[PDB]
Amino acid sequence: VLTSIKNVQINYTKNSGTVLPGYTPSVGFLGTSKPSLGFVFGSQDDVRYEAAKRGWLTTYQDFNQSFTQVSNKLLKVTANIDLLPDLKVDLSMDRSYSENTSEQYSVDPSTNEYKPLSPYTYGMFSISTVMIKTAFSPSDETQSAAFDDFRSNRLIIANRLAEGHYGSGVAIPRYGDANNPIPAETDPNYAVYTANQGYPIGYTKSNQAVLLPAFLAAYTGSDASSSSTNIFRSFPIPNWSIKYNGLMRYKYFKDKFKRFSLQHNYRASYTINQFRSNFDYNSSPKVQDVNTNFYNEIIMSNVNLVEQFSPLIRMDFEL
Amino acid sequence: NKYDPATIGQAGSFLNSNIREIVTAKSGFNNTNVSEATDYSVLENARK
Amino acid sequence: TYYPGERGPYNNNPSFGASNPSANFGGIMRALNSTNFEQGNVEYIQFWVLDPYVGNGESPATNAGKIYFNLGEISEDVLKDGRKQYENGLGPDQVMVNPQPLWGDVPASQSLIYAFDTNPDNRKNQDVGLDGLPSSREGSIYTNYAGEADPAGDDYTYYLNADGGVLERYKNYNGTEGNSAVSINDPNRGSTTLPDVEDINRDNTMSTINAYYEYSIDVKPGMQVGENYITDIREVTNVDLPNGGTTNARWIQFKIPVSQPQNTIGNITDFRSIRFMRMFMTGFNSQM
Amino acid sequence: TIDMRSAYAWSLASTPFITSINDNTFNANSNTLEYGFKRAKLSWYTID
Amino acid sequence: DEVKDYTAENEKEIVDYLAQNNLTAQRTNSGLYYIITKEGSHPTLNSNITVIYKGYFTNGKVFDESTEGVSYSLRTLIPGWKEGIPLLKSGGEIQLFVPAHLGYGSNGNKTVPGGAVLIFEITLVSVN
Amino acid sequence: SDFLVYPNPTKSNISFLFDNETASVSIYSLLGQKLIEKQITNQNPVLSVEGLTNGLYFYTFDAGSLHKTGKIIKQ
Structure with a gap:
């Protein structure tokens, strides 16, 4: 029953790049292979440790140049289906992931051990999702079912993340128990403790790890008790384009029609314009910020869910 | 210095919690000679 | 038109009719687009004004006063309570400051856009003036005039909806309550569509500084060139009036040099940031 | 010249100071309703 | 959803460490x-607080x-510090054996x- | 975003949305020519007509080969 598919177009681009400063040795007349023969032809494998051990990285202990890596992935799957003789469906699956890593480094004077210093990561992410499950719910300045789901899913996601953090062997500490009572008004954290009562200690309503997956589960129609609480997705859900020149066949040969075609497009994307690695997410015992939230490994400022019926429908017919 | 935003009004800082509010921005300093244009400046919907 | 004997907006003086009218003020203020007077080399304030002691509708010769100008950082907290009042954030279902801040309800939320919606019920609940009260709860704040129809004295009346001469029709045209009716066909036509906010330069922040320069001119019957910043006088002999009569006129040109302030209020030393201009009339006894 | 005589660009003013910041002539220093006790009526317009 | 319990394993690891190395440790109720x-x-x-701690496995x-x-x-x-630091004055030295649920989860x-016991050697020198 | 003059009846500057290639705007403004001749770039398109006068002005924006003319209003 799967013989309907006609084509499956697959495009997959993967760009990479590496800048390694402080590389002492020179090159030859016809070229070089000193770091590694693969590196000259874009190996992208770790040559920092090999170069440091071989002794041809700079020995300056206050070196101010950053080892840099870049990696872009771009998937553009496309397919065609002919479920009916006149009904043509085109599916698309787009994904983009750009990641730039940077760090400084030193070389230990003894043993020539490469030592990274303040590594950080940033980049962009984009994927084709489907949010049609909440597309037609009423929404205005007075009512929204998706926004009510957003408000409700924060506690569910917070409980899931607390069970993930506190490994269920002990009762999850919350903001209203005797261990963490509501402070007096003189304490700065009075309003923060009051605003979130049943929430676990590190996962408040304003925690990004709490209300990002809550936002996604609310506006994609998924259930918060089972949806994925990750930032990046893996499988891009297809967007579609349906064309139907089929109604004319039934009885419209003599029913005043000579041309007839319906069309429908749905294209929905989930995008993070810039995510970074948090410098506060480290091994230090300080694990909570001023808002009493746990530090997140990846921090962003904005996420975008863009849904587009272009067109929702197109009835084009010539009488 | 004592204007550390991470130590606002803990033990010896020069800032109170009122530094967080625009209404009590000047009441958020423990110093005396504080002026709204020299020492600090407040915006209410500053765009990034 | 300045009425020293008429109570101003949001005035709650228990004894206003017994007060000397020359002790009152009536003022307006405005935001300047270009605030750098040193780079722009703003040399003076020049105005051609009409002598109010010559024409047909002349003031009495004893009605002398002063007009003050202020240039610089002027507190745009019109109702001095420390909070910015924007009336697009008012209503029955909105969060207000938990204790009333001495002038009326002020929204506790954060303003985003200074614009009303287009719902007439919301507009009626919101367009209530800088007091924040809809002329029915004003008497709780303005106790000394609670028995009047407009205790705060800030209702808006359209000039084609008023009665009397041209001046009386504009007497309440500057009231901040009810001046943003949704429909243009309302008997009290709007005269604006923006909410009345305590933020004049539209930078979302309510300034509270008072560092400005003060200049002043005298308004007297016998003003002559060479003094009081008067640089020119044009006497118009006979002007054909619409009723077939004739009248005399006297235009006076003032050039107040910005570089020579008469006083300095607050800590201001240069003209590199002149964000507001205010002018207020004072010292008059009768309508001027 | 920068024209300043547009009627809709003027709005009600705060209580002013006359001699200095320490001059309480129009009750500009008070923190009560007396801040508005000296305000008389002013209409500003352009006859239609 | 892959939550895992480590309380018993962490406690047994703490007991084994306190047995192999000659140490006597008081226990809290958590x-x-x-x-x-x-x-x-x-x-x-x-x-x-001001500390000169050192944390290892x-x-x-x-x-x-x-x-x-x-x-x-x-x-x-971390909760281990919140429960251990207020047990000493300034200038003292404490040694904590924080389990996984009181540490980094x-x-x-x-x-x-995850699920690792962390040993801290903290020297509280100031309560500024 | 082809070519915009956002505030046409302005008591202030002109924001002049256009393409990347820089501009050579000018003003003549009611009678003859009174060239202003600013040097608007791609990402700093701000004019200055706030001081001149009030009237219906002629502008000739020049993005290289993109000579687009029009009228602005000083309020």
Whole structure:
């Protein structure tokens, strides 16, 4: 029953790049292979440790140049289906992931051990999702079912993340128990403790790890008790384009029609314009910020869910 | 210095919690000679 | 038109009719687009004004006063309570400051856009003036005039909806309550569509500084060139009036040099940031 | 010249100071309703 | 949803470490083991402490050393610190045996795998 | 975003949305020519007509080969 598919177009681009400063040795007349023969032809494998051990990285202990890596992935799957003789469906699956890593480094004077210093990561992410499950719910300045789901899913996601953090062997500490009572008004954290009562200690309503997956589960129609609480997705859900020149066949040969075609497009994307690695997410015992939230490994400022019926429908017919 | 935003009004800082509010921005300093244009400046919907 | 004997907006003086009218003020203020007077080399304030002691509708010769100008950082907290009042954030279902801040309800939320919606019920609940009260709860704040129809004295009346001469029709045209009716066909036509906010330069922040320069001119019957910043006088002999009569006129040109302030209020030393201009009339006894 | 005589660009003013910041002539220093006790009526317009 | 329980394993690892190395440790009611090596001449829930701690695993491999005094708020720290630091005055030294649920949780972070017992040697020098 | 003069009846500057290639705007403004001749770039398109006068002005924006003319209003 799967013989309907006609084509499956697959495009997959993967760009990479590496800048390694402080590389002492020179090159030859016809070229070089000193770091590694693969590196000259874009190996992208770790040559920092090999170069440091071989002794041809700079020995300056206050070196101010950053080892840099870049990696872009771009998937553009496309397919065609002919479920009916006149009904043509085109599916698309787009994904983009750009990641730039940077760090400084030193070389230990003894043993020539490469030592990274303040590594950080940033980049962009984009994927084709489907949010049609909440597309037609009423929404205005007075009512929204998706926004009510957003408000409700924060506690569910917070409980899931607390069970993930506190490994269920002990009762999850919350903001209203005797261990963490509501402070007096003189304490700065009075309003923060009051605003979130049943929430676990590190996962408040304003925690990004709490209300990002809550936002996604609310506006994609998924259930918060089972949806994925990750930032990046893996499988891009297809967007579609349906064309139907089929109604004319039934009885419209003599029913005043000579041309007839319906069309429908749905294209929905989930995008993070810039995510970074948090410098506060480290091994230090300080694990909570001023808002009493746990530090997140990846921090962003904005996420975008863009849904587009272009067109929702197109009835084009010539009488 | 004592204007550390991470130590606002803990033990010896020069800032109170009122530094967080625009209404009590000047009441958020423990110093005396504080002026709204020299020492600090407040915006209410500053765009990034 | 300045009425020293008429109570101003949001005035709650228990004894206003017994007060000397020359002790009152009536003022307006405005935001300047270009605030750098040193780079722009703003040399003076020049105005051609009409002598109010010559024409047909002349003031009495004893009605002398002063007009003050202020240039610089002027507190745009019109109702001095420390909070910015924007009336697009008012209503029955909105969060207000938990204790009333001495002038009326002020929204506790954060303003985003200074614009009303287009719902007439919301507009009626919101367009209530800088007091924040809809002329029915004003008497709780303005106790000394609670028995009047407009205790705060800030209702808006359209000039084609008023009665009397041209001046009386504009007497309440500057009231901040009810001046943003949704429909243009309302008997009290709007005269604006923006909410009345305590933020004049539209930078979302309510300034509270008072560092400005003060200049002043005298308004007297016998003003002559060479003094009081008067640089020119044009006497118009006979002007054909619409009723077939004739009248005399006297235009006076003032050039107040910005570089020579008469006083300095607050800590201001240069003209590199002149964000507001205010002018207020004072010292008059009768309508001027 | 920068024209300043547009009627809709003027709005009600705060209580002013006359001699200095320490001059309480129009009750500009008070923190009560007396801040508005000296305000008389002013209409500003352009006859239609 | 892959939550995992480590309380029994963490407690058995603490007991094994306290048996192999000759140490006597008092126990709290939440599973935290503390040894007060020395005292000086009590920080509360709101106090900016200064510490010279050093935190390693049960095998001695240090994951977070601080030989220079570092200032913290004591409300942002892991629950093990919140339960151990207020047990000594200024100038004292304490040794904590924080389990996984009182430390970095059951999921862990960089250089700290989930479900790992963390041994801290903290020197509270200031309650500023 | 082809070519915009956002505030046409302005008591202030002109924001002049256009393409990347820089501009050579000018003003003549009611009678003859009174060239202003600013040097608007791609990402700093701000004019200055706030001081001159009030009237219906002629502008000739020049993005290289993109000579687009029009009228602005000083309020």
